[PDB]
Structures are given as C-alpha cells and as structure tokens.
Amino acid sequence: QTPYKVSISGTTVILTCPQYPGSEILWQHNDKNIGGDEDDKNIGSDEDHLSLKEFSELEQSGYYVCYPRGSKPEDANFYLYLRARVCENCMEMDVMSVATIVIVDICITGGLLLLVYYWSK
Amino acid sequence: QTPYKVSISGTTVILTCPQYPGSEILWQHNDKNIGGDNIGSDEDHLSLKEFSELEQSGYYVCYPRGSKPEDANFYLYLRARVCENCMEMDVMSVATIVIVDICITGGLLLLVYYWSKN
Amino acid sequence: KGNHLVKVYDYQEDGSVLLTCDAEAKNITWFKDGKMIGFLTEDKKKWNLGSNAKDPRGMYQCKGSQNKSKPLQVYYRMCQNCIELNAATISGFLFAEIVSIFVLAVGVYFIAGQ
Amino acid sequence: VHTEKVNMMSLTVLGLRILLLKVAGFNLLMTLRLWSS
Amino acid sequence: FKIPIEELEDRVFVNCNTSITWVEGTVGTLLSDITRLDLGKRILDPRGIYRCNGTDIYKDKESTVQVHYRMCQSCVELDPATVAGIIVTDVIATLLLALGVFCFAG
Amino acid sequence: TLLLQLTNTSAYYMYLLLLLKSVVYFAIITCCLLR
Amino acid sequence: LLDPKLCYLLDGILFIYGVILTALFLRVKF
Amino acid sequence: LDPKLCYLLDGILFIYGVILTALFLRVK
C-alpha cells in the first residue's frame, strides 16, 4: 500500500513516501526527530519529500518513518530499512545495455558506409 | 619536514624515516613491537616481504630508543595491495613508451618504404 | 599521550578515507603539505579526502588550541595500473608488436608506387 | 576489493577496441584504394 | 514497532518474532522454518515489501519493513571526461571511415 | 577480482598502443595520398 | 563484473564479420 | 576461461579477418 520510492542520482538521494500526501511530514530515524531545521543543509525537504546529499554508509542508513502532526511517532505502521552504498557519479549497467549500444553503433556505421557507397554513383 | 619515504617494489616493501644521525630507532605497529629477531627488520628499512593487504596494515612510528612511543615525529599509515610482480605506470612512463614506439614505427616504416620504392 | 591527535577511520567496505581530530575548539582548520588548504565548519569534524583511488598523500595538521598537531601521513597505493609480467603478457606484447609491424610493413611495401 | 572502476576500464577498453577496428578498416580500405592489391 | 534486520555473514535476515508474510518483493532463497527467512547473498541487491504480526509485548500490531539495499556490483563509475572523449572519438572515426569509403568508391 | 583488473589494464595499454601505431600508418598513407 | 561477457560478445561480433566475408570470398573464387 | 584466453583468441580472429578481407577485396 503506497510503497516508498528511493530514487537516487549520484551522491544525492530523493526519498518520497506517498502514504499521506498533502500535509506537513517530518521523517525521523533512530529515535530522534530529523525534519526541517536547516540542519547541515543535507536534508532538503521542499514540500513532502526530503533529499539527502553526501550520503554515508554508516550514519543515516537505517530505519525511516512517515507520519503527520498530531499523531505520535510510535503510531505509524511503516518503516523503511535501506542500506545504500552511495557512490559518486556512477550508475548500474548490465551486459545487455552495452551489447545493445554496441550492436546499434556497428549497425549505424554499416548503414552510413552503405549510404555513402550508394551516393558514390 | 621529515619526508617519510616508502618505496614498494614487487612484493617487498622498504621505507625510511630521516630523523636519525645513527641510533637504535625502535619501530611499532598498533602497539606491537615489530622488528628484531622471521619478520623483516633493517637498520633503516623494514623489508616487508609477503605484504598482504588485510593482515598487515596500519600505523608505523619511528621513535629512537630511550623515548616514549608517543613523543615521536611522524607516522605513515602504510596501506598497500600487492598482487605478485606487476608494476605501476605513472603518466611519465606511458608517455615515454608511446614516444619510443612512435620513433620505432616511424623509422622502420619509412625505411621499408624507401626500400620498396627503389 | 602527547601532541598526537589525528585518527584515520577505516574498516569500511566502501572506497572512502577520512580523518578525525579529537580537539575541543572552534573552527579547527586543516593544514596540508605545509600550506593551509582546508577549513572546518561545525556540526562535523570529518574532513574526508575522497576515495582510496587517487592515492592521497601529504602531511595534515589540525591547529589544536595550544600550538599545532604534528602529522600522521596518508599513503594509499592499491593497484591502479597492474600490468602482469608473467610468461604470457610480455610474450603477447612482443607477438602483437611484431605482427602489427609486419602487417604495416607489407602494406607499405605494396604502397610504394605500384 | 571493490568492483567499481574495473567495470569502467572494461567499458573503455571496448571503446578502444571498436576505435581500433574502425581505424584499421579505414586504413586498409585506403591502402587498397591506392593500387596493387 | 520495527522489524530487526541483521547480516550474520552475507545474508540479510528479517525475523521479528514470528513468521513473516511476504506480500510483494523477493521470495527467493529462504531457510523458512518458522521464524527466519533471509534472501541469500548481500551483493544480490535484494528488495521487497514485507510484513510480520504481533510480537511478545505487542499483540495485534502490524508494522512493515521495506528492504531497499543498493550494494551495486554490476555498477560502473563513469568518468565524464573519459566517456565524452570516447564518444566524440567514435563519431569522428565513423565519419573518417565514411570519408575513406567514399574516396575508395571513386 | 584482482586478475580482471590486471588483464584489463594490460589490454587497455596494448590497444592504445595499437591504435597509436595505426595512427602513424594512417599519417604515412595520407602523406602518400596528398602527394 | 562484466568483462568476460563483454569480451566474448565482441569476439562473437568479430567472428560473425570474419565468417560472412570468408563465405563471400569463397563464393567469388568459386 | 580467464579473459587472457579470450583476448588472445580475439587477436588471432582479428588478424585472420584482416588478412581474409585483404584477399577478398584484392580478388574482388
């Protein structure tokens, strides 16, 4: 029900929770409240989702919570345990993508050669 | 200054700590007393042969005899990985070999062209 | 103890090296190879160097509140360039060079005004 | 022990091999364009 | 209420107090007897949305965990300079090959 | 794996060297072409 | 890792190139 | 296995291919 989406790009992570959109939400992890206090500028919460930069393997890599005001922290029924080997300027590519791009490159090169040879007439 | 120098070649690691005009200079490693008599230990180097990665790394302090192991000058924190023989190409070496090969191919190809033109 | 407060943290499976200076002061900066480069702001005392791939070096001082802190060092040489020298790689190098030279020589011979 | 940059080297060696193939084909093609064979 | 997760050697376990009812995710290598289930290798990058029921002190509660590991192994660190140079040299080389085939065709 | 990095670096240097050789060959043939 | 698979893929492509062209050469010489 | 064998076989295949290319385009 309304799963979390940890979308990441390079060293930065975008983490959003669609459990209850359209309300103030402070997400606490490991028994302390980490919301919007401008703390360290690393947690950027714009409207609902809070982003982290300079992610570390040890700290801030654990549980997570979503709930609005009024309700207590010990009320929410969801918990995200994410461990992220956060890496700088990198992505995941299987062999299939490289094979596809190589085949495409060879094909387009051959097509261009044939086109030029045809134009040579 | 005290430019702590480490040179690693092959599987043997040697090093130097220029502070000494001639003394006992005792060595330490995470509170261990590496050296003496086996484990490599020289007057100036330590000759770390069979240098594996996980079992042998950490602090290394050069402090002469008769002094506490704390009021020494520097450390090095040597961390290294040795496969077997290998070698490390700095950009100077690769530039040198590229230039040498350029010279070789240019000379030989020009000579064979001169021969074939005849 | 005395004068020695520079601890490098390790035993992490990812490629990162970092320092800790256990001093109690405000905005303790970091020296480097004898001229000052880095600067510390509060809420952190974790002046990271990056990754153990660029082979960090040099002597680092954090200005303790008495006079100074003498360095430790940094030296990381993992493998980066690792050309093997067995009876396979050097033989392959010689063989490939000879083959390429031979093919180009044949081509040039054919090239010469014929 | 990390496998982060070995993939980068294996990806760039493929680019180098494809460049070598293209340039060798080009050079052979022109050399034969000249004359003789 | 949380779902404890610990890695003994190379396996991520999920056990809270009792059997865990998988609802969507990864249900692969499991030593399911009554309590602990794991998902084999850590490097395998395991994900999934899980569940477990009331525990010793907490009856009739239901809290869910969501493992979203990212231990990338097929994972490449692209250097912008290197990739840019490779792609530009590749396109230059293919244009040069076209020029060569044109010059030969005549 | 270490062996993969070993072989990969050796082969990268080898292929760069081969491309470098083919470049000077191209230079010679194009000098012949223009003349 | 992907190096073995990539090398064998490129080798397969080059072998296909070799085979088609030797077939064409055999056609012309015949 | 080992990538070394793969690369050696690739080089042999490449030289064979270039030689056959030269012969084919010479005859045709």
Residue numbers in the entry:
A (entry chain e): 33 to 153
B (entry chain f): 33 to 69, 74 to 154
C (entry chain g): 26 to 139
D (entry chain m): 256 to 292
E (entry chain d): 22 to 127
F (entry chain n): 271 to 305
G (entry chain a): 26 to 55
H (entry chain b): 27 to 54
Provide the authors' own sentences about this structure as they appear in the paper.
The γδ TCR is a heterodimer comprising TCRγ and TCRδ chains, discovered in the mid 1980s9–12. Each TCRγ or TCRδ contains an extracellular domain (ECD) with a Vγ/Cγ or Vδ/Cδ domain, a membrane-proximal connecting peptide (CP), a transmembrane (TM) helix and a short cytoplasmic tail.
To investigate the role of the cholesterol-like molecule, we introduced a number of structure-guided mutations into TCRγ9 or TCRδ2 and evaluated their functional consequences using our cell-based assay. However, we successfully identified two strains of Jurkat cells—one carrying F283A, F290A and F291A in TCRδ2 (AAA); and the other carrying the TM of TCRα (Ile254–Ser273) replacing the TM (Met273–Leu292) in TCRδ2 (TMα). After stimulation by APCs, the Jurkat cells expressing the AAA and TMα TCRs displayed significantly lower and higher CD69 expression, respectively, compared with those expressing wild-type (WT) TCRs. Considering the functional properties of these two mutants in T cell activation, we propose that cholesterol bound to the Vγ9Vδ2 TCR–CD3 complex exerts an inhibitory effect on TCR signalling. By comparing the structures of three Vγ9Vδ2 TCR–CD3 variants, we observed distinct conformations in the TM helix of CD3ζ. Here we demonstrate that the binding of cholesterol to γδ TCR–CD3 exerts an inhibitory role in cell signalling, possibly by modulating the conformation of CD3ζ.
